């Protein structure tokens, strides 16, 4: 059997970066040079193990972590990065074994007038722990007042929505990102 990378890297609808999708890859044979040699990815650099030599290595389980970010902050999907996405949406530990695939999806995830489905967490009380998922749409407390679930001054919805256009810049275009993690069932 082959590991099901096909609906990880070619799903018709990814998830937002605050609600980053996670799939567990277990009990299968994985080919990684089919991922490596495709050249449809603008970003594929690997930390902890070289991409050519990780086809020959085995792990117990592998997490495939998929979301959609703007193309400027694919830099933030790295060990030891700071920003909105690296602190309030998706944090990688410093001892990261695993690697990150990012490719452009302007032709799919961006529509004329604005594909506003993708959101990111803008306000959060503290930095995320590595591989931590937050969903909670409680009204953020910018001030010192009982907001009581209704917005207004100093009571903000914590989820800013991405604005994606087919006319804007390359770094402002939606980049689908798949993050692979490594931990003996999943070999090459």
């Amino acid at each position, epitope marked *: 059997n082959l590991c099901p990378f096909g609906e990880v890297f070619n799903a018709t609808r990814f998830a937002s970066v605050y609600a980053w999708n996670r799939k567990r890859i277990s009990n299968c044979v994985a080919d990684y040079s089919v991922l490596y040699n495709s050249a449809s990815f603008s970003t594929f650099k690997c930390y902890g193990v070289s991409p050519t030599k990780l086809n020959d290595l085995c792990f117990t389980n592998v997490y495939a972590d998929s979301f959609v970010i703007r193309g*400027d902050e694919v830099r933030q999907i790295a060990p030891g990065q*700071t*920003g*909105k996405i690296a*602190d309030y949406n998706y944090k990688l530990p410093d001892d990261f074994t695993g690697c990150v695939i990012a490719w452009n999806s302007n032709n799919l995830d961006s529509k004329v007038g604005g594909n506003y489905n993708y959101r990111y967490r*803008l*306000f*959060r*009380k*503290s*930095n995320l722990k590595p591989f931590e998922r937050d969903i909670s749409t409680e009204i953020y*407390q*910018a*001030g*010192s*007042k009982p907001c009581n679930g209704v917005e207004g*001054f*100093n009571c*903000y919805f914590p989820l*800013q929505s991405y*604005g994606f*256009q087919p*006319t*804007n*810049g390359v770094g*402002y275009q939606p980049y689908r990102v798949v993050v692979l993690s490594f931990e003996a069932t999943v070999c090459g």
Partner: antibody
Amino acid sequence: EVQLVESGGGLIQPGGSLRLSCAASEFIVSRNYMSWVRQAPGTGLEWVSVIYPGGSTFYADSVKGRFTISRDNSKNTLYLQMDSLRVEDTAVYYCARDYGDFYFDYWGQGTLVTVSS
Amino acid sequence: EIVMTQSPVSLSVSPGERATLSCRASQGVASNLAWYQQKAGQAPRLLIYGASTRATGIPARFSGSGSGTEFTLTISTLQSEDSAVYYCQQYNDRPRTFGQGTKLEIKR
């Protein structure tokens, strides 16, 4: 009652140190995107620094390494550790609460810093 | 970084003519441009965020528009209190860079 009272600005030596302040009210510094903006005469109004909720510190390329934003969480007091000052830092320094890391929604009255001999 | 150029660098308008202020960009900022109003001896109060949204206490007289790389601020009725310096910044790339500001003055 929304205030941002700034203190600590004044004459300091060029090659000195400053420890500015911004005493907030009605919003907590520790959980808001706070930022420092300087207005120098002759040049434009220029962004200096920003701090995220809990978060992290980001600086401009003209101030990177020599400046340091460091809030306090016992009272709402945003600081700006301002070390190795040069004479191109003669500017009115504003603390400014941001919405996101987007726009300076509310501003303090500003405090002026003169660095000369 | 993005260099904003407020083109009417000083504009003297009679009290009520629907003055119009503009700033262009060195790059593309989608709707990502703010406007600020700095009166004499005051902090620059925010006027319009996202190039089209009057924030809080900002009346309907201020009518900023434009997107991409060409931007407009429209001051409608021009009381004496509108004599200030009007800035614009971008959101899209770090650092957030202001314009040179438009000094608008009223005529008596």
